[PDB]
């Protein structure tokens, strides 16, 4: 086991949530554009 692994997991979780939020933002933009 390692504690630096928990550190890297945080970076990976941040990048994953960043991609998720980028998808959410683009999706919300598309939703607002198409529905209005």
């Amino acid at each position: 086991r390692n504690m630096k692994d928990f550190e890297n997991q945080i970076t990976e979780l941040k990048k994953e949530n960043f991609n998720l939020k980028l998808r959410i933002y683009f999706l919300e933009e598309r939703m607002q554009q198409e529905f209005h």
């Binding site: 086991r1 390692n2 504690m3 630096k4 692994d5 550190e7």
Partner: protein, 114 residues
Amino acid sequence: LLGQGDFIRHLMDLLKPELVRPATTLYQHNLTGILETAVRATNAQFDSPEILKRLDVRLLEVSPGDTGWDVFSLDYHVDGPIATVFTRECMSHYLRAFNFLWRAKRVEYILTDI
């Protein structure tokens, strides 16, 4: 097994103010790059990047009353058949043996510094 002493000498050269501090002042990025920089400098320059991946850094518990030279420890990734060799019980045994070796290594390094 606390073998090649060059890494320990690297830790003495660098971690003197970090390991000297209590466990409450743990720093990770510097610790991560400390060994990486000293792998190419010490005799561990021949260590395979795969070996450096099998190796890692870890922590045991929380106790601020101990200087990091006594408190700080490492980690290692045991994977595949290597995981089947360093069993979790065997991993515990290896870690405890490394703990005793580092307890004496820290005492020896402190004696050299004294």
